[PDB]
């Protein structure tokens, strides 16, 4: 559920992101994707922390991750203006 990113920094104590922003080593910060990224050395370990809903109608519903508030939502593929049904997310 996670994925490594090749750090673009020449600093062994700081990792550089795509936005050119650097973070202190062993530090865990969060981005727009409300993910958790830790600066190792030459590779940042990032992972998704957005709760994934389940139990919805796979034939009458879909999962769309909103980047506005960084949270999962489920709407009727037939009705994108309405919600579905979830029995409990997972992470």
Swiss-Prot record:
Corpora lutea, mostly in the luteal cells surrounding blood vessels. The modification Pyrrolidone carboxylic acid is found at residue 1. Its main location: secreted. GO terms for cellular component: extracellular region. Keywords: Disulfide bond, Pyrrolidone carboxylic acid, Secreted, Signal. It is found in: Secreted. Disulfide bonds join 2-47, 15-39, 34-70, 37-46, 61-84. Belongs to the beta-microseminoprotein family. Homodimer; Interacts with PI16. This is Beta-microseminoprotein. The lineage of its organism: Eukaryota, Metazoa, Chordata, Craniata, Vertebrata. The chain holds residues 21 to 111 of 111 of the full protein.
């Amino acid at each position: 559920q996670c994925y490594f990113i090749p750090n673009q920094s020449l600093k062994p104590n700081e990792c550089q992101d795509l936005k050119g922003v650097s973070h202190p080593l062993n530090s865990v910060w969060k981005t727009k994707d409300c993910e958790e990224c830790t600066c190792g050395q030459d590779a940042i370990s990032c992972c998704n922390t957005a709760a994934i809903p389940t139990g919805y109608d796979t034939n009458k519903c879909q999962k769309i991750l909103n980047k506005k508030t960084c949270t999962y939502t489920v709407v009727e593929k037939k009705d994108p203006g309405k919600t579905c049904d979830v029995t409990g997310w997972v992470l």
